[PDB]
Amino acid sequence: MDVNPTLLFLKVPAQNAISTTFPYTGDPPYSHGTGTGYTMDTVNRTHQYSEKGRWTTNTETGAPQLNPIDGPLPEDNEPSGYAQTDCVLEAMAFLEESHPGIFENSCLETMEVVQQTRVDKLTQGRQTYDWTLNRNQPAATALANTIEVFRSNGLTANESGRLIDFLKDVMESMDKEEMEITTHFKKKQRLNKRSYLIRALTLNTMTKDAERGKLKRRAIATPGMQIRGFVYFVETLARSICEKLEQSGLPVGGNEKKAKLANVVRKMMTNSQDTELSFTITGDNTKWNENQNPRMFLAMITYITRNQPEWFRNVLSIAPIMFSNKMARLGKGYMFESKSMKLRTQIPAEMLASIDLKYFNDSTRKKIEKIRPLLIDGTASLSPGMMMGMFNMLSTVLGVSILNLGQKRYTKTTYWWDGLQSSDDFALIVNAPNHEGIQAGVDRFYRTCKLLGINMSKKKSYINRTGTFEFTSFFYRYGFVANFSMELPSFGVSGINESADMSIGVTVIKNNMINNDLGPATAQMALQLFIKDYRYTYRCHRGDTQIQTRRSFEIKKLWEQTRSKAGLLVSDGGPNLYNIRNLHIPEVCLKWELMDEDYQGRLCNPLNPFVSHKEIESVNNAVMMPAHGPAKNMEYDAVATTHSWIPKRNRSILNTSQRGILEDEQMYQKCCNLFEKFFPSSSYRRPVGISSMVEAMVSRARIDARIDFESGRIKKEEFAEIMKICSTIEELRRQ
Amino acid sequence: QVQLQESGGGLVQAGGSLRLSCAASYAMGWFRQAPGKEREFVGAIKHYGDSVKGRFTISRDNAKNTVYLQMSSLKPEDTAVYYCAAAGDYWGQGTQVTVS
Amino acid sequence: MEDFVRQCFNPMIVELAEKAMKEYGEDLKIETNKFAAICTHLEVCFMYSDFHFINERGESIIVESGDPNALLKHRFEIIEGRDRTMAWTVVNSICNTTGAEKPKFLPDLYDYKENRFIEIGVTRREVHIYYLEKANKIKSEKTHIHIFSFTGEEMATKADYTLDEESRARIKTRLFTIRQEMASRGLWDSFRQSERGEETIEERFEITGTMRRLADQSLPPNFSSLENFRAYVDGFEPNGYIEGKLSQMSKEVNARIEPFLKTTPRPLRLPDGPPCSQRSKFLLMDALKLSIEDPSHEGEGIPLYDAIKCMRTFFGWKEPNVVKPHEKGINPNYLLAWKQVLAELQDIENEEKIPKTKNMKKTSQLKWALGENMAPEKVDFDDCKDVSDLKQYDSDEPELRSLASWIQSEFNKACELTDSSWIELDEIGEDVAPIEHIASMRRNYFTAEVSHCRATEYIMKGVYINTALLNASCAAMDDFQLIPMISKCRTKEGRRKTNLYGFIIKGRSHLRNDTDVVNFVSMEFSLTDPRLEPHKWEKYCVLEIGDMLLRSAIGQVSRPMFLYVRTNGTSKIKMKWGMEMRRCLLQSLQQIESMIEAESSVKEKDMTKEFFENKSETWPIGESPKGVEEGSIGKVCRTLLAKSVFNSLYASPQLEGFSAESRKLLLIVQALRDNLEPGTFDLGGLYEAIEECLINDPWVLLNASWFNSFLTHALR
Amino acid sequence: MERIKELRDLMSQSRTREILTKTTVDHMAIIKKYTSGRQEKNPALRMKWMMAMKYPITADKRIMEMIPERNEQGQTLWSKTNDAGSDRVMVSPLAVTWWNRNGPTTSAVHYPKIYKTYFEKVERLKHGTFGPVHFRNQVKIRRRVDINPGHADLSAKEAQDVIMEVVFPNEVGARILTSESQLTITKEKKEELQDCKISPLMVAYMLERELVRKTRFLPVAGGTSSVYIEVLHLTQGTCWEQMYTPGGE
RNA sequence: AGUAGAAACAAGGCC
RNA sequence: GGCCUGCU
């Protein structure tokens, strides 16, 4: 007899055992080298899906741009980006009519937010493409570098501390004859108008790793800092709009998505009488981002912001204006090998414009030949369409408009449709009195989608009777069925620290028990395995064992020293008291009454040199990138113990010409620590104002010395010493 | 309306002392003019220039209607055509001080 | 008017007033009288506060110039002259230290004698109105208020005047100096009434310059300016434009539904080529175990001593010789490496105490076997351009290979029971709730079912091997290291036992990226002759190292005993994911527990015990030439565990792609079997998407064969 | 005394003087987050990889003067080589366990008073009473429920001023809290935590967690109470219901 | 050789 | 041969 697990589906329905079809127990695919090939392929594919448009050359950037809008209507089922302006404007108008007051309200709240938003909001972001160094750097670092360059060039309106003023300075920089940047190898280099325009309109391309569910790798993009404020405002407007649309599912979580899917299916099927047939289409959109033209987003926003202050319209329109002229950096480059001479070489992507094509294979040779005409200063113009879901929410708005355009008031026919859209994925429930009606409805829905630059993937889509469908790895079969294979990768040690890892693991087990219908015995097994892996990872074994490690000696002496050994934490080699009933309690508090007072005091000592807290945002928040989803943050319950240390940093900056960044880091951190000691609320509430550091610090020294004498340790001798030391630092700052 | 007459100038030794006085017919100033130059600020009433501070003292008697400039530790570089007194628009004719 | 503040007031005050001007964001060129008025307010604040000191008594000491001493305390300490944030900082600090009441508006000074605030304001109008005006602005105030006015008069409540009168004569002399100096200037046409409390501003975000031209090039094809396009949008109204283009659009743009029937789906085509080879990092079906029967636990003990003791338990060693060559390497190197390992093992046996971890010599043998100094040296392009052989890295579709029957048998025997327990679980909090007791009983049942399973043994082998390899790579980055493959089990009798499959030599492991490869050489004992399925051992070199005698009724077999030696490699990501193989247990048993719960939701009672003991219900878990064979729930547990283990062992992008694109077709087939009239828009496209994932991986090809068999058995 | 002294020492050196002079208060946050350290994409892989090194964690410089450089057998506990972009020094994990067996001891009696939420959870569970498990299909319907069982009927911003006035009374600024509920909360949490020396930031964070109301969408069947939602994993399942009554009731 | 698979590893750089 | 780094 030959064993075959798949035959199990002959008795258990597919959805009731779908977890077996998710090989999420092995290493996910990773990219190894350059992503330049993928970037070039994506650029060429985006440009050839809109080949029948019209070509122009921008007078500012001098780059060739392709406009397919209002182009010839498609005559085949292949992907097409020839969106029609009038059709999309009409779709938005019908969306407004079905939801009166949506645009005006959303614009009002967006106007409030834009005129009260601060610059620091831009620091709350992941890697961004700093143009000062032409590389990806943390959002805060890139923002600081750009602000420094602007201030050195004379653009100091951002000193007002307002994001709108920062954007005003950004736009004013566009009209400057010559800017100056700094490079280390420090050298001051001058950038002319066109070079700075291209550096501000460019995107950095990388390869996406840890992407499960496809054989081929893809490319993703990261924009600069000049354009992120406009993107933030536009996405704020789009989120405020989608929050008023029940057909959208992008700005919500997973459980809300499931609830809305259940509600829509029940509404569609229940209202349908015996005569009407119902069919569900589990649709995926092929080349979703490559076929969405930024000009059409400009049209949608300018229709949304009608009868609004002109400044609001301008600030919300700046973003799509820059995306329509966006450029993409090709990537890291290409690495060549010569086996005859036994050597390797790494050529940067910027040489692709001039480098001969003898080194490249046929596929890459043709890709380079096709993309060369669009190469301007080492970057390729990508006007026709978006690169990687930067305007997720606006795309969801367009999809929701398409979905609502079939409310049976615009169809003008017996058939009708509804459903749920989340960018690149949708479920469409279509009802009609007969199979011919369903066919006509789906055909018209597809045709209308093709008029908006949205394509339906026929290969990854199928239609059945309502009651069974899929949506973003959520399988609905007369009710959503748990999978538990999507969350399997999150059952190990997170990698934050000991206490954080313990709390995160127990909380993940608890949550997957609540949401993903994890069984009790399975949860106990998960707890046991997690504890085993945790002890084997942090070298913290039970203590009563003879497992020799680098940490087994101190742990054993602590074990033999303690009297009530049941109170020792698993991190210190103690027994595990966790169970299904204790999954919502931190380890420290669960073992508090069992700890010896000496060990308890040594553990939770504020003066410990290991605990370090930076800001209110990073107290008990851990960023865990979930499998098959975007990066997410979780609140984990933990007590600040000596085990809450933060791990070592990379330390490879020491071998790079960018070595002075570490000295600047140290000096900035010293100044920030001094300010915090002067202003204790610096971390919890970020200080605001327009004065400089030393003014506030010296003046508060004055006052605090005064009052702490009026009652406290200070003495006249010390108070006068502080006053004249303040005068000394004053005259020092004078010179 | 405000006429001004300076007194107390003359030839003096280097490191010597001299008390200028200006009788008047308001804030007051003492200004000086070297042979090869325009006006130089000395003192006003109190504030003194860098070249004369600590050496020179300005004072006034509002009952006598007089402003005084007490010069001490004089240098050859105090020599000027002339130490003029002023009321603020109204300028004295100046008194010669020559230090040597 | 600004010429006055150029002339009279000192720098300190003028820049203080200029920063106060910047504070609330209004411009000085439009209205300057406010600047002069508030700078005079600030000046009176200073001149009233300074020159006033206190000593340990009350009765402030007044000195025209502060002498050098510790006695420089200031009688009145200023509030204004600071930013709003700091003004409120001082307010709150004084309230919290003085125990006084917090005012709602900005004071100007604080004093000790009377322990309270002073809000000085000198207005153009006479005092006896401005005083009570600001008083009714401030609610129930104990802070004393004192104001002057240009005529020279003073006033205050309580008839209180807090310090010397010569200072106030100073104040009013300053005041009339101001007055009859504007007399020379002539400003009272507006000086009395120049500020009326204007607060208004319009936000201006103007598109101009280059950024405007960009806006003119981001419009539809037949538009010339953003102004015109916005005007058109504002004037646009729906007039049935989607219908016109829908009618005009070609009818070939359709989404016709192709019915999906029993005869529609065709079997997935498998690639053809040379048979598929073995990819695992260790032997799974052909492993052999040398044991000692020690009482130590899994992690307890020292590796090298245990390995040597286990190997000394076997007698019959012969001089090794080549049996099956690598067919691409230098087998004599493998032979010499094996003999070197034996020699150095003896060398450890001789000395005093067995080292916890041993380093081996870097001979040419393992230099070749571990791929040392073979990475091409990195150079610059400007120095290597004329080399004809210089080209890209080989980037093409992997070699095509057809499925072989060995993977099927390997999976078959990976789901079979064993004579040992390969899982020793940790401790949990004592169960207190009845649901916890039910969970514990279920867990005990599953552990009894799966512990005696080759899948659990493979899990432990992989976890231990990858953990040791990662730790050695991170610790001994430079020097080759010896690691014996150790796994500890428990017999039926209950006696604990150790097992030594072989050895792993880890090489240079300077791993920077998650994809960087660490090469090692693995040696494992076995009895399976490699002359029967040579195509499964394409990358192995197999020697003959001894003879084994296992008790059998046919005299005694005296079988040969071979050594499978190969060069393999891994990476940080692969090591990390292989050291988390225990979650296969989770996956499998979560699936089984979901089955049990779903069935128990029907009958209102827990159904675990009868499922595991009666074994009445069975699921299709394989096909025999006679037909489909069904097994009890325990066999399903073992089968799913083996499937998860093989997923973790043979993981690859092909597996992910095939899994997704075959789950799609499985859902379609399930819809067909449920009588839900399934339909497809392009089924050929889906088939081509599935078939492109099957290239050379044995596991994915076996999964595809299983899928074809399931289709054949289904659709009936 | 000290604080202004390192201020003067910083201003002594030209670079830090320039940083202090030209940098405005508003930019405080930016430069504080200014770092070359990228946020890790795969934390688990490197935590499993770094812990195999010697000196894998980081600690303040003060550790060099509280913990000896080596333990009894000579295993090093800390190193004097500083981190990449900080003055902290890299140390071994043993320095943690050492601190828990011979490090300085204090009085942790006030931690229960600080971490009110967690200890209240423990007390509620310790006195809970379980019941029989009933096996029947549960119709889990998704609903919006409040998870925090100690929220004082305050929002984030609404309680943020309360938290500042409780911890940072001087940086409150204009705000003086009007609602009398906030008055009593301030009084209680002021007199209760008057000398607690854990950290201002952690105290503020835990006060925010305790007082601020927070809500999330979850699949529930029955219950719906705040105390009954924290144990939602233990009382409700796919095909079983476990009757439970927390200690509070 | 080996790992791996649309491009890489099989140490890097600095003296 | 000596020393530096391992997400920069």
Author numbering:
A (entry chain B): 1 to 185, 207 to 756
B (entry chain F): 1 to 25, 32 to 51, 58 to 100, 113 to 124
C (entry chain A): 1 to 716
D (entry chain C): 1 to 249
Provide passages from the article that reported this PDB entry.
PB1 houses the polymerase active site, whereas PB2 and PA contain, respectively, cap-binding and endonuclease domains required for transcription initiation by cap-snatching. These structures have revealed that the polymerase is a highly flexible macromolecule that can assume a variety of distinct conformations, enabling the polymerase to perform both transcription and replication that require different initiation and termination mechanisms.
Using cryo-EM we determined the structure of 17 polymerase-nanobody complexes at resolutions between 4.5 and 6.7 Å; this is sufficient resolution to accurately position each nanobody bound to the polymerase heterotrimer. The most populous binding site, termed site 1, is on the PA endonuclease with five nanobodies (Nb8198, Nb8199, Nb8200, Nb8203, Nb8209) that bind at an interface formed by the short helix α1 (residues 1–10) and the long helix α6 (170–185).
